[PDB]
Amino acid sequence: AIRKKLVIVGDGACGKTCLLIVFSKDQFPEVYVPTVFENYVADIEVDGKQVELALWDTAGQEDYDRLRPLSYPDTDVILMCFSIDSPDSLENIPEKWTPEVKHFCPNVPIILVGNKKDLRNDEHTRRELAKMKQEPVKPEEGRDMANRIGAFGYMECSAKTKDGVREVFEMATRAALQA
Amino acid sequence: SMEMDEKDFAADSWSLAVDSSFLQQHKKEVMKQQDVIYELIQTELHHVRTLKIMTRLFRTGMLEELHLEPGVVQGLFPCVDELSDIHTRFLSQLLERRRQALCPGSTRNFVIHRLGDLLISQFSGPSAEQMCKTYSEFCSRHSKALKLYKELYARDKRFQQFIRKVTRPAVLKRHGVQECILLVTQRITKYPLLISRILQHSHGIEEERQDLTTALGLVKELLSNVDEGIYQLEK
Numbered sequence: 001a002i003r004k005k006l007v008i009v010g011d012g013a014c015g016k017t018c019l020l021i022v023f024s025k026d027q028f029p030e031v032y033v034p035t036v037f038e039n040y041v042a043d044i045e046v047d048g049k050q051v052e053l054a055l056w057d058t059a060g061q062e063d064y065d066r067l068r069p070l071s072y073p074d075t076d077v078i079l080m081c082f083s084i085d086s087p088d089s090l091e092n093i094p095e096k097w098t099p100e101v102k103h104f105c106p107n108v109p110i111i112l113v114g115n116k117k118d119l120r121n122d123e124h125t126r127r128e129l130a131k132m133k134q135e136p137v138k139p140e141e142g143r144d145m146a147n148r149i150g151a152f153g154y155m156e157c158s159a160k161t162k163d164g165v166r167e168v169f170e171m172a173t174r175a176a177l178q179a
Numbered sequence: 180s181m182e183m184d185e186k187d188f189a190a191d192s193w194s195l196a197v198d199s200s201f202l203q204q205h206k207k208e209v210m211k212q213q214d215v216i217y218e219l220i221q222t223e224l225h226h227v228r229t230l231k232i233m234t235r236l237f238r239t240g241m242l243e244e245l246h247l248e249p250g251v252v253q254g255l256f257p258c259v260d261e262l263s264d265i266h267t268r269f270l271s272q273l274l275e276r277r278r279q280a281l282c283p284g285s286t287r288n289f290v291i292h293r294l295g296d297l298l299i300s301q302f303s304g305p306s307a308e309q310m311c312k313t314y315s316e317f318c319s320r321h322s323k324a325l326k327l328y329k330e331l332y333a334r335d336k337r338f339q340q341f342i343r344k345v346t347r348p349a350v351l352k353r354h355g356v357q358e359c360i361l362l363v364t365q366r367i368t369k370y371p372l373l374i375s376r377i378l379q380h381s382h383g384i385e386e387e388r389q390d391l392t393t394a395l396g397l398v399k400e401l402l403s404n405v406d407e408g409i410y411q412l413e414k
């Protein structure tokens with residue numbers, strides 16, 4: 001089993017901690033969802049290759065521009081996260097997270113991930129967004145952003161329903177293997 | 180970590196750690212507050228445990244089995260003794276506040292009603308000053324330690340033998356040398372997330388909502404100070 005490293009980056013309420021918890025537990029926490037994520041080493045087997053995948057979060061470091069880059073050394077794949085119920089989090093991707101991720105992690109594959117895709121069919125979400133002259137992030141808007149930032153690919157998921165969560169991490173493993 | 184604490188913090192939540200009959204006669208908001216409190220202590224146990232893996236397993240192990248140059252082991256594990264003293268004292272205070280809150284006749288049924296005071300003493304005064312200096316030093320020496328470990332691994336086959344040996348147990352899967360360093364670095368940034376979610380469910384007593392609000396500001400001031408004090412050191 002080769003050891004590869006994954007780091008998930010993104011704004012505060014993009015659901016990156018929830019995504020890492022749901023994958024590292026295999027199910028959605030039925031009693032209590034932890035506030036924090038320490039680390040986890042995944043035993044993923046993708047396309048016949050056995051890989052050990054270290055999972056790391058950057059939650060709580062978005063305000064500390066000198067502590068944050070310390071999660072980047074030896075990163076093999078970057079999960080660039082945004083929330084589908086927050087068009088503003090997608091707007092910050094090209095001008096805040098992309099310049100930093102490319103500076104500290106050159107030549108490292110970035111997968112743009114749209115979290116909370118379930119909320120695209122949530123009435124409260126569509127009403128709350130409409131009051132601020134907005135709507136949930138469309139699939140083509142997310143795809144266009146990955147195209148623009150030079151991302152390796154674009155994926156969507158929902159940690160609440162576990163839908164697409166496994167495919168993101170199996171694809172992140174594939175991306176980390178490419179040399 | 181000791182078995183007593185491992186079992187007291189084995190459950191995935193406070194609602195699962197206490198007896199269900201004890202949980203039953205408690206307001207939903209109390210359960211929500213206790214769950215985040217239980218998590219702050221549970222992660223502090225794991226943090227102190229990570230520091231014991233660095234000091235006793237890795238750092239001591241190299242000193243007693245290998246022939247490394249003087250200053251090399253200190254460069255790999257900077258401030259691990261001082262960090263261990265800080266967090267083991269903090270954990271001691273957290274575990275004592277929980278033990279005092281135990282129901283007579285029980286070893287699992289408790290409700291911690293006052294946490295903010297404990298957090299204020301920890302993140303203020305000389306104890307805050309010592310964490311600020313210890314985390315500014317640790318994080319400024321972080322990159323150098325990772326490069327020094329990779330240099331030792333990609334040049335010494337007696338070091339690879341030692342690393343393969345000590346990290347072989349299943350319990351150290353996510354606790355290699357480099358993982359331990361990032362786990363310690365990220366620890367400080369977890370506290371504001373924990374304290375804010377405890378504060379979120381601590382509006383019942385105005386004395387407690389104020390203590391936790393003060394402590395949240397104290398932690399954020401410490402984090403801002405550590406952030407400013409960092410300047411990466413290259414070998």
Ligand SMILES: *CC(=O)Nc1ccccc1S(C)(=O)=O
Nearest residue numbers: 198200201282283284285288
């Ligand atoms: C302290 C204690 O014994 N608590 C307990 C344990 C199990 C069931 C009920 C209770 S109670 C009535 O809340 O004290």
Ligand SMILES: *CC(=O)Nc1ccccc1S(C)(=O)=O
Nearest residue numbers: 307308311312315404405408
């Ligand atoms: C973070 C740090 O190094 N702080 C420090 C160092 C020396 C004296 C005082 C202090 S402080 C601003 O009280 O934390």
